[model samples]
Target: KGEELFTGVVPILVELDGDVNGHKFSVSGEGEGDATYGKLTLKFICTTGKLPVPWPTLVTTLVQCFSRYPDHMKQHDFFKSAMPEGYVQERTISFKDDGNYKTRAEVKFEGDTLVNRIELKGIDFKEDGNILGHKLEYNYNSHNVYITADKQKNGIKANFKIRHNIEDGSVQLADHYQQNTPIGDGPVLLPDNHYLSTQSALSKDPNEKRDHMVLLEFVTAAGITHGMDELYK
Candidate 1:
């Protein structure tokens, strides 16, 4: 089927660790949510040690990166409302003993559940150096608050388990290296304003095609954010 897949809401930030315009950057707080009918603040934070660029140049460059994906972010509400300001803000980033200037973009979802998925789109820029504008795309699938991987991969390198769960929350997923779970169809049960998310990093490929089939929980709550750790733990 040539039909386009609709990746749902990614509970947490779709982090990226790679080079942008030849500069190394470990980015986070970057994702998409419903726009007109929901709340989503798209922020890409470069928590790395070095500055990808000065404040003004890097901030403008961040939003510029979302343009690669014509379907995901471009079609979503974030870019549609492209305030640029809300997408990023100036701040001082501290890493353990090192501190530097950085930015943040963690949205306060106040509308419909984030779209079933969001595209951690890529940015391709040609500068003095190589046109190394490489972007390893990522997809986020959501689950209801009450859902979880009941029987995912057990003791192991932890890099083995990939994909979402079954109807009963059993750990059973498919297509690790080739494709993603078709979500243009559906996933876990979601409520009106409830979002409890858990995630699993799959297809951790370095040459591209990096995806995360997160377990979107439909919990009847909101505000703040949770991690990929087992809830209620």
Candidate 2:
């Protein structure tokens, strides 16, 4: 009976330790509700130097995706085809980075969907000699969260996949490149490949209420940190 009132309100947190281009770092965050829905905040700190191309962009992008919380859940896909009852409120998020960077966005509900307009400050997201502005958009529908950014830089154009387990919720980076690498077209796959992969997990804290454990990992081409393979286990 006691668990019923809190059925959908489980606290979650994740802690991830890994390396990007040899730069070691840790990521931690907390979600203040059920694994499927709630307010979540993540923080990434590099113990060494900074990470290489796209890592910072990827980190902030994931935060923006999860900011929708319960609305982004797979089970809520029905909400895409039909609008929720009553007036939906708008939400604002401010995410601070380890450096001077900051990610800020406003989530607004429109008819049957949720839209997130994001802006990144204090970081460079350039590709192919072009400076990529950190402006991004995330549209949450029944099927999934659709994301896109300035195409000139190719910095943020991808979809997100999320799954829930008995005690944990997992978020994975999905798209053509990460899912299927041509035989020799991309970085060689090694135990270290997990570093380049962008994946995160959150689990309920066993000892405390309203607490959780968060873990995140990604790869970098600039450097490498030894023994990061242990994080895959």
Candidate 3:
């Protein structure tokens, strides 16, 4: 991995209102390039306006959920017994700790492809283990969420695509009015916005055909500010 992987990092801030929880979530700063996978530093500032659940419980539960990937559980006790049911142990590829509320989670190297997953769950200010609020199921690949394993190497890429669920309206997603087409593609984008653009580089060695470096960036199209907004936001 290299710093190039993070060239397009973006920030996200969510403010809750009404009976729903409210909080500020943003990607404060990030940089890639290390011994293991790339690196992303995120910041989540949440204030449950009028919820009935305790903030700490909500945050901790969500943190535990995100951190319990099989790859991580093998090393961290807090996550060992929490791996999702029916998921085989070898399917996991990578695990990350986002450094927000002491939280992090990840999966990688599935079936020749690499998949990365991230999640944020916010609860009400009242109940325990009750999901009063949440930002769940953000994935790097469409085929895998918490259980599938993809190992194909498409290099690093980003796209904007719709957010969907098997059950209609069962899950609440943020508005896409400001989100561009191809919305919500792949784990989480650098800027966390829709405006698909990709950058990739291949290894010089013939044997390392799959070993390539790729980058994705957003570009504003004519008569549209979405791309620009995604870049700066």
Candidate 4:
């Protein structure tokens, strides 16, 4: 077994078909690997102009995801009504200039380490069904976003929250939020109300990945300068 690599994934930004949720898009985190070990496939539910995070519920580590290959995933018909708002539409990072300061809604996709997600752990399962039997569940609910100016930490920002049960699926427009605290570079606990939202409307559909997916949200005030720091793990 050469390099017996089990698992890994990286995002590929490419031109996409139609608006995913409601914004013209690129950046599908979907992967390409040895089908002999794992065959990765994808589908999409097109809309006005946005998109969603693309992590499958049925992924088997039988193949190493770090394998590099030309990106081949395009857009197709799928669903996201059961998912959260701003989530169904292909997820994107909108960083713009606000005078001497910069503002961005989402940050994980920027790539240059200006901001990034921190994966806590992953649990693989081999159960039933064709794909479900090979499901990979990952919960990465922490990020490194601090509003700073002139090389100093900006005052603590309360600009993020994981809506659920009562406040799920309602356009992710709550930039200035209620919860308080900076999402430091640590795997913090998901609050009582903000649990990961699963496939609510399409759980019974065989064509959906359902619960185990990358349904995450993060807000940061760091511009091209405030990228995250690599905590030697």
Candidate 1: where are CA atoms >4 Å away?
Answer: 1-11, 30-38, 50-233
CA RMSD, predictions in order: 18.2, 21.0, 20.8, 20.1
Worst 10 residues of 4 by lDDT: 74-83
Candidate 2 stretches greater than 4 Å from native: 1-6, 35-38, 42-233
Candidate 4 residue lDDT tens string, 1-233: 11122223323222223222232333223323232222232222222222232222111101111222111210100011111111111122221110010112221223311122111111221123212232222322333322211112211122333211112322221122211222233222122111111121111225544322222222211223212344443
Clashing pairs counted in every model: 17, 16, 31, 17
Task: Give each model's whole-structure lDDT.
Answer: 0.27, 0.28, 0.22, 0.21
Cα lDDT tens digits, model 3, 45-136, are 23322333223222111111121112212221211122221011111111112111112224222332222233343323322222333222
Give the CA lDDT, 0 to 100, for residue 227 in model 2.
62
- Candidate 2 lDDT, 188-233, residue by residue in tens: 1121111112234333335633222233322111113356568899
Model 1 whole-model lDDT (C-alpha atoms): 0.27
**Best candidate, TM-score:** 2
Q: Which residue ranges in model 3 land beyond 4 Å of their true spot?
A: 1-40, 47-51, 56-181, 184-233
Stretches > 4 Å off in candidate 4: 1-117, 121-150, 153-158, 167-211, 214-233
